[PDB]
Amino acid sequence: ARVAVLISGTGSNLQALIDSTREPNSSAQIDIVISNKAAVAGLDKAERAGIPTRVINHKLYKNRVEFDSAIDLVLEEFSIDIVCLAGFMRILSGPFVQKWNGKMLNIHPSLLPSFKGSNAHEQALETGVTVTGCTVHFVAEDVDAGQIILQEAVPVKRGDTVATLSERVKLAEHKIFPAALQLVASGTVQLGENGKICWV
Ligand SMILES: NC1N[C@H](N)NC(=O)C1CCC[C@@H](c1ccc(C(=O)N[C@@H](CCC(=O)O)C(=O)O)cc1)C(O)(O)C(F)(F)F
Numbered sequence: 346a347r348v349a350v351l352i353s354g355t356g357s358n359l360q361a362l363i364d365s366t367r368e369p370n371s372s373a374q375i376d377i378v379i380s381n382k383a384a385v386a387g388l389d390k391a392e393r394a395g396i397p398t399r400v401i402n403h404k405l406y407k408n409r410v411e412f413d414s415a416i417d418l419v420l421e422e423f424s425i426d427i428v429c430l431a432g433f434m435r436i437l438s439g440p441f442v443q444k445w446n447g448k449m450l451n452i453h454p455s456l457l458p459s460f461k462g463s464n465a466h467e468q469a470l471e472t473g474v475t476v477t478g479c480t481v482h483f484v485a486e487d488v489d490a491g492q493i494i495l496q497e498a499v500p501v502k503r504g505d506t507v508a509t510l511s512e513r514v515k516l517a518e519h520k521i522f523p524a525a526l527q528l529v530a531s532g533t534v535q536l537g538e539n540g541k542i543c544w545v
Contacts, residue, residue, distance in 0.1 A: 346426040346530040349377045351416070351433040356387025357515055358431035358452055358522055363394045365523030372530035377423045379416060381435050397423075403435055413441035427530060430484065431522070434463065442486050447536035449484040450529060452522045454514050456480060456496055461489035466507045466514070475501050477510070479518045481525035483536050492542045494534055495521040 348366065350359050359378060366373045378391035381403045391398045399419055406412035412435070420428065430451040442449070455465035456478040462468070469477040478498040485491035497517040501510055528534040537543035 346373050347376045347424055348373050348427045348429060348526070348530070349379060349420055349423065349425040350375055350391075350429045350431050351379045351381075352385065352387040352431050353380060353382050353434035354385050354387060354432045356385065356390040356432070358518055359387050360390050361519035362429060362431065362523055362526060363390070363396070365527070371527065373427065373526055377419060377425065379419060381412075381433070387432070409436070409438040410440065413438045417441060417444070427526070428484075429522070429526060436488060437484070439486055442484055445484070447483060448529075450494070450522075450525060451482055451484050451489075451491070452518050453480045453482065453489050454511070454518065456498065457482060457489060457493060466510050469501060470505065470507065470510065477501055477514065479514050479521060481521050483542075492536060492540070494525045494528065494542065497521050 350362060352359055363375055366375050375396055378387065378396055378398045380388055380400050383400050388398050401415050403412050406415065426448065428445055428449040453465065455469060457480040460468040476498050478496055480496045481494045483491040483494065497520065499514045499517050533545055535543045535545065
């Protein structure tokens, strides 16, 4: 399968995906990396790996549908089968999500359905959980609410900051995201017609 990775920052998840798709017997290859923000480290990681990049600046579009179409054009240009959202920070419009239904994955740093949203760690610390984790899910219209592919629990330590908890959880993300991509790229895991996850 030909894979696009969308990013908005550092690209540590991207990196782990790059490394795993290049292990032998991989069912996936990353063919394009797209950022909605300029000068992010994720772009350097892509180019150092010999993978083409684009910056599609979301602030230059009148609305989300048009920004999403600019992304979609690049995905067509590159004959993309599967899209990975790896620290991508833009909510995607209805028709884009529908088009990519069953073919677009996201990494989220909590055990869904707890702590939906971009500040999951801040919420986890406020709430006082001793166990959090991360989740790979198919992307649905509803934010952080698509069908769950894989999850991994991660302990919260007494005295954790957003930074320390975030680093511990990234360690788990870098395991399950590549594993989930392989599962989908190989057709082992599919979004079924009944809207539910299917393992073959
Ligand atoms: N891109 C998606 N589109 C749709 N329709 N459904 C999804 O499930 C997507 C996956 C969302 C992934 C995450 C997520 C949740 C909320 C936002 C959000 O509020 N974005 C704002 C911009 C916020 C900002 O600049 O800080 C904005 O206005 O776009 C950004 C990302 C995530 O919480 O899981 C995390 F961890 F990635 F942040």
